[PDB]
């Protein structure tokens, strides 16, 4: 049972997104900021199962890097899912708005947090299917938390998705590891679009041909090596999230290890005599 919140305790203050709206608001239980997702009159049976299913999933979880469920409004209409407020919004937009503003150690710490959340989910037998920086939220302590929970409602996003999931719909924690590799590239590039302007068909062709994303600028060699191992075609060869967490924790605890950078391939020549 999730916590049932009375609507008098919830003050919607401003629209912060869509998913039928997501609000920033306050929750009285002194008041605390929350995110508030609503479900309007006329919702179908499937919408209700998906909506409360998302809450039911999140209520089973208790981890630092997983968005916390404060409670639900289900006895009154419109129904609401109330979650912890993440002041800095989605990670992809956050990185793009803060280009170059963080240390390599901060960026890798963000990835460690995401990986710890994903290790928790996988161990809990939850396959995310839509892991991407756009679905990771950032708070005012720079902590990154996996969000976007549900079933059929979360989705395919081709350039984040593992080949076996594209080709025959096999979604597992190992296809989430592939996605996590893409998220590593997103973070280290401050939110560049994976595969830039290649079309979805061109991306799948490139992957099948063996091509992989090139090294980000200023990227520790150990970090590029780890994301490349996330992108092994053979599922069984990919690291598990336990391995990823272990490696990232060891790199962070010996931070001089991150000063060794992978070579960056320039896509431009500048010659000055
Ligand atoms: C659709 O569900 C929401 C959801 O569940 N959630 C739960 C939850 N908690 N906290 C949230 N914060 C924000 O959505 C948010 C958005 C923009 C924001 N500002 C925008 C302008 N920027 C310049 C500064 C930052 C600041 C905070 C959300 C959303 C969701 C949204 C995005 C990714 C994952 C989930």
UniProtKB/Swiss-Prot annotation:
Modified positions (Phosphothreonine) in chain numbering: 38
Q: Where is this region: Mediates interaction with ARHGEF16 and ELMO2?
A: 3-273
The Phosphotyrosine modification is found at: 23, 126
Q: Where does ATP bind?
A: 16-22, 37
GO MF terms here are: ATP binding; cadherin binding; ephrin receptor activity; growth factor binding; molecular function activator activity; transmembrane receptor protein tyrosine kinase activity; virus receptor activity
- Where, in residue ranges, is this chain on the Cytoplasmic side? 1-273
Give the GO cellular component terms, alphabetically: cell surface; focal adhesion; lamellipodium; lamellipodium membrane; leading edge membrane; plasma membrane; receptor complex; ruffle membrane
> Which disease shows up in the entry for this protein?
Cataract 6, multiple types: An opacification of the crystalline lens of the eye that frequently results in visual impairment or blindness. Opacities vary in morphology, are often confined to a portion of the lens, and may be static or progressive. CTRCT6 includes posterior polar and age-related cortical cataracts, among others. Posterior polar cataract is a subcapsular opacity, usually disk-shaped, located at the back of the lens. Age-related cortical cataract is a developmental punctate opacity restricted to the cortex. Overexpressed in several cancer types and promotes malignancy.
Subunit annotation:
Homodimer. Interacts with SLA. Interacts (phosphorylated form) with VAV2, VAV3 and PI3-kinase p85 subunit (PIK3R1, PIK3R2 or PIK3R3); critical for the EFNA1-induced activation of RAC1 which stimulates cell migration. Interacts with INPPL1; regulates activated EPHA2 endocytosis and degradation. Interacts (inactivated form) with PTK2/FAK1 and interacts (EFNA1 ligand-activated form) with PTPN11; regulates integrin-mediated adhesion. Interacts with ARHGEF16, DOCK4 and ELMO2; mediates ligand-independent activation of RAC1 which stimulates cell migration. (Microbial infection) Interacts with human herpes virus 8/HHV-8 glycoprotein L/gL and glycoprotein H/gH heterodimer; this interaction triggers EPHA2 phosphorylation and endocytosis, allowing virus entry.
Q: What does this protein do?
A: Receptor tyrosine kinase which binds promiscuously membrane-bound ephrin-A family ligands residing on adjacent cells, leading to contact-dependent bidirectional signaling into neighboring cells. The signaling pathway downstream of the receptor is referred to as forward signaling while the signaling pathway downstream of the ephrin ligand is referred to as reverse signaling. Activated by the ligand ephrin-A1/EFNA1 regulates migration, integrin-mediated adhesion, proliferation and differentiation of cells. (Microbial infection) Acts as a receptor for hepatitis C virus (HCV) in hepatocytes and facilitates its cell entry. Mediates HCV entry by promoting the formation of the CD81-CLDN1 receptor complexes that are essential for HCV entry and by enhancing membrane fusion of cells expressing HCV envelope glycoproteins.
Which family does the similarity line name? Belongs to the protein kinase superfamily. Tyr protein kinase family. Ephrin receptor subfamily.
Q: What is this protein called?
A: Ephrin type-A receptor 2
Q: Which organism is it from?
A: Homo sapiens
Q: Give me the gene this protein comes from.
A: EPHA2
The part of the entire sequence present here spans 604 to 896 of 976
């Amino acid at each position: 049972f999730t916590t049932e919140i009375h609507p008098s305790c919830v003050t919607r203050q401003k629209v912060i997104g869509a998913g039928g709206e997501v609000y920033k608001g306050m929750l009285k239980t002194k008041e605390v900021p929350v995110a508030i997702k609503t479900l309007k009159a006329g919702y179908t049976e499937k919408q209700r199962v998906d909506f409360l299913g998302e809450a039911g999933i999140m209520g089973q979880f208790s981890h630092h890097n997983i968005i916390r469920l404060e409670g639900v409004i289900s006895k009154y209409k419109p129904m609401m899912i109330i979650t912890e407020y993440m002041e800095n919004g989605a990670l992809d937009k956050f990185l793009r708005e803060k280009d170059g503003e963080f240390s390599v150690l901060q960026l890798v710490g963000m990835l460690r947090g995401i990986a710890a959340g994903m290790k928790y989910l996988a161990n809990m037998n939850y396959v995310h299917r839509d892991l991407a920086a756009r679905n990771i939220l950032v708070n005012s302590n720079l902590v990154c938390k996996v969000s976007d929970f549900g079933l059929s409602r979360v989705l395919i996003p081709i350039r984040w998705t593992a080949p076996e999931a594209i080709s025959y719909r096999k979604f597992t924690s190992a296809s989430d590891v592939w996605s996590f590799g893409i998220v590593m590239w997103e973070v280290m590039t401050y939110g560049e679009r994976p595969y830039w302007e290649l079309s979805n068909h061109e991306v799948m062709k490139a992957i099948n041909d063996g091509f992989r994303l090139p090294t980000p600028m200023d990227c520790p060699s150990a970090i590029y090596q780890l994301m490349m191992q996330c992108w092994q075609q053979e599922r069984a060869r990919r690291p598990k999230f336990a391995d990823i967490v272990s490696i990232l924790d060891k790199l962070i605890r010996a931070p001089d290890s991150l000063k060794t950078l992978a070579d960056f391939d320039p896509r431009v020549s500048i010659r000055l005599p």
